[PDB]
C-alpha cells in the first residue's frame, strides 16, 4: 500500500512501507526518527551516504533479517553503514558471524575482591607487573624442569650408581625436581582455589596438562615410601611438562587448535600411510625374497623400510638389492610424496586460518 | 540546502553541495572550475567518463576524505579518474598506500659537486659506465676473497706447515687476502667520506656488513704484531664476506627483507622443532633403552636422530632397533613434515610479496 522511496545519493530504492517497518527499532523503522532526512519537496528520504551498501541494508528489511556484506564494499565502510542505520547490535553480531569474526567474552572474573586479585595476578600476565613476573617465573621453572628431565639420563652424571642393581634427598637432581614440583603444585592449587567455578577448572585441557605434569612425581614418591612396567610408563609420561609451556605460548595454542580441527585429515594421513606401507612392503618382500642376500625377512620387517622411503627419510639400513625390489622402492618414494602431500595442505590451511585469525 | 546532481554518462549522483565543496581544491570543489561541464539546460554537471569509478570519487567527498578503489575498476582507469577529477596529490598518495605501493624517495644526494660525484660513482652502479665497472670490480674482489677463504683450508696447500706446532708476507694466500682487504677498506672509506650524513652510514646493515668483513683481518694483524678461543671465533667470523655480496644482488636483499618480516614464523618453526625433538627423543630413548644393542645413550643423544628424522634428512648413523622405537621413529618423520610445513607457507608468502613487489 504505502510506498516509501529512499534516495541514497541519486539511487532510488522504492520499497513497500511494510518491509521498511518490519523492524521498528532501526533508523528506518521509526517514523519519528527517519523524519529528519525526509524531503517533503520530492517525497523521498534523501540520504548522502555510500550507494552500494544500501542494497544490503534494504535486503535486511526485505528478507526479514539478514546481513550479507556486498563483496564490493569494504568491511569498515559496511560496519559504519550499519552503525548509521542503527540496525541494532544483533545486526552487528550477525555481520561479524557471517564475516568470520567470533565473539566470546566469558571470562567470569570472581567478585570476592580477593578471589579475583590473585586470580588476575596468576591467570593474566598482562594485568600487572607482578603478573608478568609470575609468568616469567613459571616459564623459567618449566624450562629448568625440562632441562633436569633431559640431563638425568646422561651416563656421565650417573657414576657411583653405574653398577649392577645386584651390586633420596642427597641426589642433586631430586632437589631441583622437587622444587619444580613444589612450584607446579603451588601454581595449581592457587589457580584452583582462586578460579570462579570449579567446573571450568576441572575441564580445561591446560589444567589437565598441569595435573598430568605433577602426577608422576607423586606416584614415584608414594611407591618409594614403602611394578616395573608402570614405572617406565610413568618415567616416559614425565615428558608432558613441555606441554604446560603452551599456556605461555600462543604458538602452541594455535598448534593445538589446528590439530583439533584437522583430526579427520590427520586420520586420513595415517590411513594412507598404512595402506601404502602394507602395499609396498608386500611388494618388496615378494620381489626380493628369492635373493639370498636380501634383508627383508618378512612383510612386517619391510614396513620400516617402506615408512622411511615413503617419508623420504631413507636411513639406508634396509634397502632393496634386486632389480624388482629397486623398481618397487622407486614407486614407494614417489607414492609416499603424493600420499603425504594430499592432506597436509588442508592441515596447513587450518593452521593459517587459526594463525592469522589471532 | 543546495543540491548538485552530477551525471556520469546517464548515472545520476545527487549529493549535497556542502559535501561537494568540503574540499575546495578539486575539480568539483571549485565552482569556477566545474562550470565548464555544467549543463544549464538540465541543471546537471554532465560528464562523459567511466561510470563505476565516480562512486568512489563521490565517497571521497562524502567521507571527508578516503580513496578506496572499487574492486571492479582497474588500477589505471581509477588513477586516470583521480587525475581527471584533480582530487590532489595527497589523494594519489592515499590511493597508492591503500593499494600497497610504497612511496619512498629519500636518497639525499650531496650537493658539494664533488662529494656527490664519487658518491654516485660508487653507490649507484647505473649512474655511469665507470660506476658499472666499479660494481663489477667489487663483485670480482668479493668472489676471489671467498675463494681464498675456502682454499686456505685445503690440506694440500699446507705442506711445509703440516708439522706439529712444537716442531708473514711470503704466504701467497696472505697477499691476495691483504689486497682484498685493502680494496674493501678503500671502498668503505670512500663511501664514508662521500656519504651525505654520517648518521645513515653508521646505521645501514649493508655498511655494518662491510665493517664486520674487515674487522677480523685487522684483529689478526694486530695480534700478530706483538687467546686461542677468540682466534677461532674470528676465523669463523671471516665468513661474513659473502654477505657483502648482497649489495650487488637484489635476490639477497629480498631474502633479508623476507627474513626480517618472517621473524615470528622463524621463531615458531624453531620452537615447534624443539618441542617435537624433545618429545620424540624422550619417547625413543625410553622405548629403546631396554635393548642391549641400542645406540641412544640418553635423551640428549636422541635429539640428533629426532632432528634428522623430523627434517627427513635421515643420515642413518643413529636409527631405532626396537619395534617400539621404530613406531616412534615413524611418527617423528610424519610429525616433522607437519611441524615444518606449517609456518614455511607464511614465510614463502612473505618472500613472494617482497619479490613480486620489486
Amino acid at each position, epitope marked *: 500500500g504505502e510506498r516509501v522511496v529512499i534516495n541514497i545519493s541519486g539511487l532510488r530504492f522504492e520499497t513497500q512501507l511494510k518491509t521498511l517497518c518490519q523492524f521498528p527499532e532501526t533508523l528506518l523503522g521509526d517514523p519519528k526518527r527517519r523524519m529528519r532526512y525526509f524531503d517533503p519537496l520530492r517525497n523521498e528520504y534523501f540520504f548522502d551516504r555510500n550507494r552500494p551498501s544500501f542494497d544490503a541494508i534494504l535486503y535486511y528489511y526485505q528478507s526479514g533479517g539478514r546481513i550479507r556484506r556486498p563483496v564490493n564494499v569494504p568491511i569498515d565502510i559496511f560496519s559504519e553503514e550499519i552503525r548509521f542505520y542503527q540496525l541494532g547490535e544483533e545486526a552487528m553480531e550477525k555481520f561479524r558471524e557471517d564475516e568470520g569474526f567470533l565473539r566470546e567474552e566469558e571470562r567470569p572474573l570472581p567478585r570476592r575482591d580477593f578471589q579475583r586479585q590473585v586470580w588476575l595476578l596468576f591467570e593474566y600476565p598482562e594485568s600487572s607487573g607482578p603478573a608478568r613476573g609470575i609468568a616469567i617465573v613459571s616459564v623459567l621453572v618449566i624450562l629448568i624442569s625440562i632441562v633436569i628431565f633431559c640431563l638425568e639420563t646422561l651416563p656421565e652424571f*650417573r*657414576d657411583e650408581k653405574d*653398577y*649392577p642393581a645386584s651390586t633420596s634427598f642427597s641426589d642433586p637432581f631430586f632437589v631441583v625436581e622437587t622444587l619444580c614440583i613444589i612450584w607446579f603444585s603451588f601454581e595449581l592449587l592457587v589457580r584452583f582455589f582462586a578460579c570462579p567455578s570449579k567446573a571450568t577448572f576441572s575441564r580445561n585441557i591446560m589444567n589437565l596438562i598441569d595435573i598430568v605434569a605433577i602426577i608422576p612425581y607423586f606416584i614415584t614418591l608414594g611407591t618409594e615410601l614403602a611394578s616395573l612396567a608402570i614405572l617406565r610408563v610413568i618415567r616416559l609420561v614425565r615428558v608432558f611438562r613441555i606441554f604446560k609451556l603452551s599456556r605461555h605460548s600462543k604458538g602452541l595454542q594455535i598448534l593445538g587448535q589446528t590439530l583439533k580441527a584437522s583430526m579427520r585429515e590427520l586420520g586420513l594421513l595415517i590411513f594412507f600411510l598404512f595402506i601404502g606401507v602394507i602395499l609396498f612392503s608386500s611388494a618388496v618382500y615378494f620381489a626380493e625374497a628369492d635373493d639370498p642376500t636380501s634383508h627383508f625377512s618378512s612383510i612386517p620387517d619391510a614396513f620400516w623400510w617402506a615408512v622411511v622411503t615413503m617419508t623420504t627419510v631413507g636411513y639406508g639400513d634396509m634397502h632393496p638389492v634386486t632389480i624388482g625390489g629397486k623398481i618397487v622402492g622407486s614407486l614407494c618414494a614417489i607414492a609416499g610424496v603424493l600420499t603425504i602431500a594430499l592432506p597436509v595442505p588442508v592441515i596447513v590451511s587450518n593452521f593459517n586460518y587459526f594463525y592469522h585469525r589471532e | 540546502g543546495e543540491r548538485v546532481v552530477i551525471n556520469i554518462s546517464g548515472l545520476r549522483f545527487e549529493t549535497q553541495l556542502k559535501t561537494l565543496c568540503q574540499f575546495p581544491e578539486t575539480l568539483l570543489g571549485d565552482p569556477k572550475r566545474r562550470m565548464r561541464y555544467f549543463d544549464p539546460l538540465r541543471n546537471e554537471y554532465f560528464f562523459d567518463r567511466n561510470r563505476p569509478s565516480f562512486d568512489a570519487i563521490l565517497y571521497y567527498y562524502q567521507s571527508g576524505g578516503r580513496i578506496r578503489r572499487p574492486v571492479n575498476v582497474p588500477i589505471d582507469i581509477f588513477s586516470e579518474e583521480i587525475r581527471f577529477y584533480q582530487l590532489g596529490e595527497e589523494a594519489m598518495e592515499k590511493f597508492r598506500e591503500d593499494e600497497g605501493f610504497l612511496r619512498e624517495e629519500e636518497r639525499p644526494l650531496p650537493r658539494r659537486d664533488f662529494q656527490r660525484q664519487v658518491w654516485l660513482l660508487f653507490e649507484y652502479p647505473e649512474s655511469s659506465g665507470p660506476a658499472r665497472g666499479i660494481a663489477i670490480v667489487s663483485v670480482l674482489v668479493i668472489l676471489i676473497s671467498i675463494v681464498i677463504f675456502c682454499l686456505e683450508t685445503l690440506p694440500e696447500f699446507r705442506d711445509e706447515k703440516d708439522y706439529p706446532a712444537s716442531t708473514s708476507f711470503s704466504d701467497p694466500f696472505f697477499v691476495v687476502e691483504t689486497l682484498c682487504i685493502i680494496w674493501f677498506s678503500f671502498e668503505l672509506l670512500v663511501r664514508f667520506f662521500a656519504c651525505p650524513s654520517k648518521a645513515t652510514f653508521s646505521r645501514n646493515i649493508m655498511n655494518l656488513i662491510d665493517i664486520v668483513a674487515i674487522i677480523p683481518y685487522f684483529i689478526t694483524l694486530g695480534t700478530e704484531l706483538a687467546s686461542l678461543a677468540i682466534l677461532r671465533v674470528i676465523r669463523l667470523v671471516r665468513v661474513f664476506r659473502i654477505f657483502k655480496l648482497s649489495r650487488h644482488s637484489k635476490g639477497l636483499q629480498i631474502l633479508g627483507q623476507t627474513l626480517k618480516a618472517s621473524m615470528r614464523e622463524l621463531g615458531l618453526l624453531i620452537f615447534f622443532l624443539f618441542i617435537g625433538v624433545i618429545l620424540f627423543s624422550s619417547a625413543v630413548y625410553f622405548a629403546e633403552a*631396554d635393548d642391549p*644393542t*641400542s645406540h641412544f645413550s640418553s635423551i640428549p643423544d636422541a635429539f640428533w636422530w629426532a632432528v634428522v628424522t623430523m627434517t627427513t634428512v635421515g643420515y642413518g648413523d643413529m636409527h631405532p632397533v626396537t619395534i617400539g622405537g621404530k613406531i616412534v621413529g615413524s611418527l617423528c618423520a610424519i610429525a616433522g613434515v607437519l611441524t615444518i610445513a606449517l609456518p614455511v607457507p607464511v614465510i614463502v608468502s612473505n618472500f613472494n610479496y617482497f619479490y613480486h613487489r620489486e
Partner: nanobody
Amino acid sequence: EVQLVESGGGLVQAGGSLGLSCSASGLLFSRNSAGWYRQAPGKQREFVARIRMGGSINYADTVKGRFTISRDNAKNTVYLQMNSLKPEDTAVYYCSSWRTGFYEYWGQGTLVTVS
C-alpha cells in the same frame, strides 16, 4: 636372549700372567658398561674392575696396577689382563654388562685358581 660367555680357566700358579675374555651375543659391549666380578669360595661377590661406556676404567682397591681391563668395540669382547698373580685372588671371576636402571647381565663364570 643374551649370554656373556667367558673363557678364563687354567691353573696358573703365583706369578706369571693370564688374560680372561668375555664375549657377548645380542649385547654390544660398546653400548653398555662392563665389569668383571669375582667370588671366592665361601665368600660373596667382590668388585674387580669396571669399564664404563666411555672408557671410565676404575679398578678395586686391591687389584689396582696388577690388573687391567680393555674393550674392542669391533670384536665385541671385554678382556682382563691378570698380572702379578697371587694365591689371594682365587675366585670364579664372572663377567657383567649392564645399563643403569634397565638391565644387568652376567656370565656363568670362569675359574681362576692361583696355586
